[PDB]
Paper text:
Bacterial microcompartments (BMCs) are organelle-like structures consisting of a large quasi-icosahedral or polyhedral protein shell up to 200–300 nm in size and an encapsulated enzymatic core. The glycyl-radical associated microcompartment group 2 (GRM2) type BMC locus encodes the glycyl-radical enzyme-associated microcompartment (GRM) subgroup that includes the choline utilizing locus C (CutC) choline lyase as its signature enzyme. The GRM2 locus therefore contains five structural shell genes encoding four BMC-H proteins and one BMC-P protein. In this study, we demonstrate a practical production system for recombinant GRM2 shell particles from Klebsiella pneumoniae and the requirements for recombinant shell formation.
We analyzed cmcABC′D + CutC336–1128 BDPs with cryo-EM. We calculated a near-atomic (3.3 Å) resolution map for the icosahedral particles and built an atomic model. The particles had a pT = 4 quasi-symmetry with 12 cmcD pentamers occupying the vertices of the icosahedron and 180 BMC-H monomers that were arranged in 30 hexamers within the facets. The map is not of sufficiently high resolution to distinguish between these three types of proteins, so we chose to model cmcC′ in the model, since the mass spectrometry data identified it as the most abundant BMC-H protein in cmcABC′ + D small type particles. The resulting pT = 4 BDP particles are 250 Å in diameter. In the pT = 4 BDP shell, there are three pores: one is in the center of the cmcC′ hexamer, the second is at the threefold axis between the cmcC′ hexamers, and the third is in the center of the cmcD pentamer. The pore in the center of the hexamer is approximately 7 Å in diameter as judged after subtraction of atomic Van der Waals diameters and contains typical GSG pore motifs on the rim. The pore in the center of the cmcD pentamer has a funnel shape and is approximately 16 Å wide on the outer surface but is only approximately 4 Å in diameter on the inner surface as judged by the Van der Waals diameters of atoms forming it. The narrowest part of the pentameric pore is very hydrophobic in nature, as it is lined by tyrosines and phenylalanines. Substrate and cofactor transport across the shell is probably mediated by the largest cmcC′ pore since the other two types of pores are too small or hydrophobic to be involved in this process, if it is assumed that the pores are mostly static in their conformations.
Residue numbers in the entry:
A (entry chain AP), D (entry chain EP), F (entry chain DV), H (entry chain HR), J (entry chain AL): 3 to 88
B (entry chain AK), C (entry chain AO), E (entry chain EO), G (entry chain DU), I (entry chain HQ): 3 to 83
K (entry chain AM), L (entry chain EM), M (entry chain AI), N (entry chain DS), O (entry chain HO): 1 to 65, 69 to 84
Amino acid sequence: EALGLIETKGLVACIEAADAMCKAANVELIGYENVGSGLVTAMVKGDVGAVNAAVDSGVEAAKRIGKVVSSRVIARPHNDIEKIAG
Amino acid sequence: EALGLIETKGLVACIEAADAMCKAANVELIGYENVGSGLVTAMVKGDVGAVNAAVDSGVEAAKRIGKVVSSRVIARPHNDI
Amino acid sequence: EALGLIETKGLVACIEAADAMCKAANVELIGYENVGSGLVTAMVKGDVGAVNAAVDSGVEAAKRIGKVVSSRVIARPHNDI
Amino acid sequence: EALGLIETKGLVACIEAADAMCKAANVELIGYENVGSGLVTAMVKGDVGAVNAAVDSGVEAAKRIGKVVSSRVIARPHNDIEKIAG
Amino acid sequence: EALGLIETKGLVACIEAADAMCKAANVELIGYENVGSGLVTAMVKGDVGAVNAAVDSGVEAAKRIGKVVSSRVIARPHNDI
Amino acid sequence: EALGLIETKGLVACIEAADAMCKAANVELIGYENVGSGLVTAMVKGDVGAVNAAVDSGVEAAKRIGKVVSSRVIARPHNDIEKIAG
Amino acid sequence: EALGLIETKGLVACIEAADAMCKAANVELIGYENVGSGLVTAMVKGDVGAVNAAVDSGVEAAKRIGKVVSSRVIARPHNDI
Amino acid sequence: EALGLIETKGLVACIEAADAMCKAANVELIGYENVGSGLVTAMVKGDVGAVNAAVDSGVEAAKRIGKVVSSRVIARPHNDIEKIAG
Amino acid sequence: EALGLIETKGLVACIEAADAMCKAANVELIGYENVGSGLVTAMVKGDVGAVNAAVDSGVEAAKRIGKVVSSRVIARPHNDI
Amino acid sequence: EALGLIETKGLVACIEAADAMCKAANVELIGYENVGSGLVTAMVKGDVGAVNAAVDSGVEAAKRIGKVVSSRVIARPHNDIEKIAG
Amino acid sequence: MILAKVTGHVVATQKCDELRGSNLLLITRLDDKQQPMKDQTWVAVDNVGAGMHDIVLAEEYFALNYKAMSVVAIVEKVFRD
Amino acid sequence: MILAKVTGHVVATQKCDELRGSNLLLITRLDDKQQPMKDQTWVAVDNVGAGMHDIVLAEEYFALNYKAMSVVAIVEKVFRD
Amino acid sequence: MILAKVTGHVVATQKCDELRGSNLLLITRLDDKQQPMKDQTWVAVDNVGAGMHDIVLAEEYFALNYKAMSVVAIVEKVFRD
Amino acid sequence: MILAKVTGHVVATQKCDELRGSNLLLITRLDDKQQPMKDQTWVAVDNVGAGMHDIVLAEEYFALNYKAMSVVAIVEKVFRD
Amino acid sequence: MILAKVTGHVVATQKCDELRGSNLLLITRLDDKQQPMKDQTWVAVDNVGAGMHDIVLAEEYFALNYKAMSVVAIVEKVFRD
């Protein structure tokens, strides 16, 4: 299934993005993964149409209180990619 | 076998790069390694015709949505490496 | 199931919008609702990939011959709604 | 069969549009449907060539005494649309 | 059945108009009628989708080589006419 | 077979056009047909190559002494058209 | 049968003209005739649809590589000629 | 087989062209044919590649001492054309 | 048989020229000959239609990556040569 | 197999190019071939992907200390060409 | 153009931007008895508002939709003899 | 171009604007015996005035009608051996 | 466009520059049962990120990749009846 | 391009102006034994002076004749193994 | 693009100027077992230096050679499953 990512500076902007994403569509939250320098990333997973809608809403809520560094939807990830996220 | 590297600022740009790399040819993805300051690196390995094609594809895809810091193909890597 | 809305000034522009919506994907049309001041609203419902495609087509067709005031897709509507 | 719509401000301009339409082609008048603010809409129904001709004549007569807001011909309406009009 | 008219200045432009009309759809041509001052009129009759298509085509062809004065389609002609 | 038409002001320019046409190609003259205002029209009939050639010479001779209003070659007239001319 | 003529300055331009004429349609070539001052003329004969097509092609080909002085088609030549 | 033509003013420039052509490729010389006004024409005959090469050298030698009016290679002459030359 | 020559400055431009020559037509490659000052010459031989095509192709390829000094086709070479 | 060529002024820049090429990919060195004026050429041979990579590194090392005149990769040489090199 | 019949539609979410807000119909070419053929289906960007079971006139590459294959006419009568 | 025979016409009322005022003929490709084939019909915008049963010369995409497939010549003789 | 299914990929090292940094997928046209056909494979420059086994929407010549045949949409649902 | 053989010509009098003064040859595609096929004939605007029975190299749409299908080369040798 | 195999070459002396100094290869389309098909040969202007027996990637009309069909890539590996 599709894969949606949001990357923010700081953890607070990422919990607001992850909360909005999970409310605004039927998606599953995989988890957070930070890489230092304050960059934190949220990963949701679901059907392409749902995941698309979720990422649009999640970026809109997070950008409102903090900084959204980047967002991206992968409509069909390679099977190798589902060993780096999970 | 050859070895290709892409280095990007931020993790999201690195998963787009690694997705384009893995679809472009028959290479196996080794894994990520972040060294701080927001620099994340993806590493693939395979034959040198495949690795050359993957790294060129991954660079253009990650360049579209983020900053690509550096890329490199090592055709015959030393055994100490 | 998802829910899509288009709001137009005048009834004619709303029937053109609802015709494009119903041809663009497999959505069932619920019905119209005018609130006065010339604002008429059409509401469809279906899967979120279909509803997203219908609302985008309906907006462009109604835009051609009238004024589209607002449009919106609600992916997971609350049960109270 | 096809479907033709004219929308005017006020009822008088719409009775002149509906009268001209029924005279100028072999169409059937379905009825009027107003939505407040003075907008009234006439709906005719017939073959595509007839309905086309009717709407051109009806707008020409109605524009002469009042305001024609919009006109439109749907050559083949969806079956769902034939539950909102009728 | 419907009725279409094209009016041209000169007979030559009228035979080009009537040739384009008769090839464009399935209409039967009734005949010419000149009223003086160089005005000649061609009259066809058939179904209103065919007669429409014919008159649009005949006007563009006669326009190319002469002067077209007027054109008209009468969808439901009165029985007195 | 094809159909060639020349239209002139006055009868003299049309007898010169009709004479030149019949000399310069293997065509058959159908007749004259005037419509008042001094417009007279000549109609020849034959194969497309002949009728083409005739009409070019006929206009060149007629234009020399009078006014050629219009000229035209129909390569394949509809059968209905061969009841208005003949 | 019809008759077509091309007149060119110089013999080379006349053989190019006559080669294009004989390939363009089904005409039989009669022969050349020079009258002095460098003017050479080629003469073909055939049906008037073929001769018209040949002379138009021969003129354009000889025009490309030389000077074409004159061309002419005679549809019904007199028996004295 | 192909056909190559060179046309010059005067006979001397044409004997130099005909000599250079016969030396520089495997072609056969058909003959000269003058048409007055000093225009003389040489005609060679052979395979297309040979005849092409010959005409290039023949024009280069003839242009050196006199005037080359025109040159031309026909890769495949019509059979009718091989009754005007020969 | 005919004979074609290309002369280039440097050996690399001459192997590109020779490679294009041998692929463009059915000619046999004779061999290289350098005369000093950096001038290297490649020589092919075959039918005159093939050799004409090879030399034109080899000149354009070597021109792309080096300097082509001279080229030449000799259609009927003398037996002393 | 493919064929890679580097050409330099002088022998020292060509031993540095040949050394870098053989280190940076799995290629085979065929030999040197000088043509006077100080131009020396190195020839490597291997798979297309390897030979490509080698020539890029070899030109980069040689250009660093001397002059690289030209470089070239032939992906599939004609069989005749493998009698001039070897 | 070709005569064809609309036989379905396609719902695509991940797609380019030149295709946003348009219908995507399955278009089956029909034979000389007005009957669909086998293995003759294309995807056409609707442009005039065609729906299921309608006989349309599908045009090839260039219709400014830009070279997407689009529908350009809804057919009333096909006179054929 | 292709040799074809006009076998009918199409009457379309709801259509684009690039097609207003033109004929739409059914055009059947005919084989080497001058006989129509099966399942080889296109729709062509007439351009020179062709009618039923006439052998025409139908051209592909670009004829400024803009890339509609149009008829560009009416054929007199087809010499074939 | 045509409905097709990605069935492989192509690794090409020696190629033009208009194709640097792009995927090259094998694209098999599938029939009216959503099943690949025989001898119906093209090579398409991926443009939206399609991988193996995915049903895509392959477009013909012009997609600015410039006239390479590219993939322009990944298909979710194919409603067909 | 395709290998083809000239098998006839077409004489057309009533035609557009982009085609005035040019040959119109019947062009039959020939198979891998240098033998014409069945139902594979196009009409090509000659451009280099080809005649009957000659094996030519017919090019598709764009050759500035403007997109007419023209002949661009007369073939001497076809080496094939 | 299509996968094809070079199976010969064509030697043409009398040809246009847009084709001077280029190779002309016979290009046979090969099926899903990497085996050439029957009656599927085109002529392609080589662009990257392909020779006999090589599997190449032949592109359609527009490759600036200007719309000649050219070869744009030499294929190393065709992974297909």
